[PDB]
Design a protein around this ligand. Structure first.
Ligand SMILES: O=C1N=Cc2ccc3c(-c4ccccc4)c(Br)[nH]c3c21
Ligand SMILES: [Br-]
Ligand code: NA
Length: 336
């Protein structure tokens, strides 16, 4: 891929590569000049020439033709796909050009959180967008801050005496949702494993089956990360992940424990986790009950945390739907 994704390379006798916007497992996304469309900049996803990513790219193209036809104006803020082509055996998907991902903005700003009023707007848009998917018999399955992009990531920058550091303040917090290569229709095969680990729902970890509610779980994780500026379940070990969950949210429901095929995590229907081991003391000291993460007792913080708590309901059958989430009091300040 390195040989065809360089600055200056031309794709499909039309798109001149400017630079790389980001890289993933799948390949990379590059900003290009569209020399046919008078020099307009676009984003081109160059997909690795590897079966699993080719297949996901083909699936993404189908999902986006469906979504972009149903919502041609992007009222529901899914990214607009413009075209696709093949270039030296790589599938390339052209999209409208967006700004930084919400993840990169956090990272570039030194892992500082977003302001609450921005979180409120971003959350509403994310819920609206994913609800539109949920209304069309789709589950995204891979929601994460890297897949939520600012329409424009421009910021103002000033020294802030309070934290004795320069600080970027986002100008326009409008977002779009990207990456529909894992999105699954209600009547299609469900992989056992979905979502990036940190955003993965307990029903997925426990291999209990999943559907739209697993997106809601991922959104809860995203919102807490927007609030705090860091990932709340940063581990790569499933058992430790579940231990973190229990410290933050309390014990898993017994019926879910009883149903799982992943017997290895449990012993006599409780998590098989030594709280006094090294890893265990770390989980106790670093994690804590969800509400203790609040940085203020002000009612707007309480409202956000009530919503996050409901999104992080363990039992997916009881978890708040995005339809209900859009009516939550946290969003009242957006409404006339
Ligand atoms: O500007 C864009 N218009 C569509 C699009 C899709 C994915 C991206 C990404 C991206 C996201 C996750 C991992 C790697 C890259 C960036 Br950063 N910019 C993108 C755009
Ligand atoms: Br980015
Ligand atoms: Na998770």
């Amino acid at each position: 891929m390195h040989l065809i994704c360089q600055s200056g390379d031309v794709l499909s006798a039309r798109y001149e590569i400017v630079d790389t916007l980001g890289e993933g497992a799948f390949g990379k996304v590059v900003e290009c000049i569209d020399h046919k469309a008078g020099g307009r900049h676009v984003a081109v996803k160059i997909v690795k020439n590897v079966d699993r990513y080719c297949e996901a790219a083909r699936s993404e193209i189908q999902v986006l033709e469906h979504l972009n036809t149903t919502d041609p104006n992007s009222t529901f803020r899914c990214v607009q796909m413009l075209e696709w082509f093949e270039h030296h055996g790589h599938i390339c998907i052209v999209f409208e050009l967006l700004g930084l991902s919400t993840y990169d903005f956090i990272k570039e700003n030194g892992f500082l959180p977003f302001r609450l009023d921005h979180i409120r707007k971003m959350a509403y848009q994310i819920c609206k967008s994913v609800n539109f998917l949920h209304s069309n018999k789709l589950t995204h399955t891979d929601l994460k801050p890297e897949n939520i992009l600012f329409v424009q990531s421009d910021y103002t920058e000033a020294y802030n005496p309070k934290i004795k550091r320069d600080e970027r303040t986002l100008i326009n917090p409008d977002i779009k949702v990207v990456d529909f290569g894992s999105a699954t229709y209600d009547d299609e095969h469900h992989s056992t494993l979905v979502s990036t680990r940190h955003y993965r729902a307990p029903e997925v970890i426990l291999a209990l089956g999943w559907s739209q509610p697993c997106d809601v779980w991922s959104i809860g994780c995203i919102l807490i990360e927007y609030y705090l500026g860091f990932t709340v379940f940063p581990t790569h070990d499933s058992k430790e992940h579940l231990a973190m969950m229990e410290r933050i949210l309390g014990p898993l429901p017994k019926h879910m424990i009883q149903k799982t095929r992943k017997r290895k995590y449990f012993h006599h229907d409780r998590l098989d986790w030594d709280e006094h081991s090294s890893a265990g003391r770390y989980v106790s000291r670093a994690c804590k009950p969800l509400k203790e993460f609040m940085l203020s007792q002000d009612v707007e913080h309480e409202r956000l945390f009530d919503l996050i708590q409901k999104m992080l309901e363990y039992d997916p059958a009881k978890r708040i739907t995005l339809r209900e989430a859009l009516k939550h009091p946290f969003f009242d300040l957006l409404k006339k």
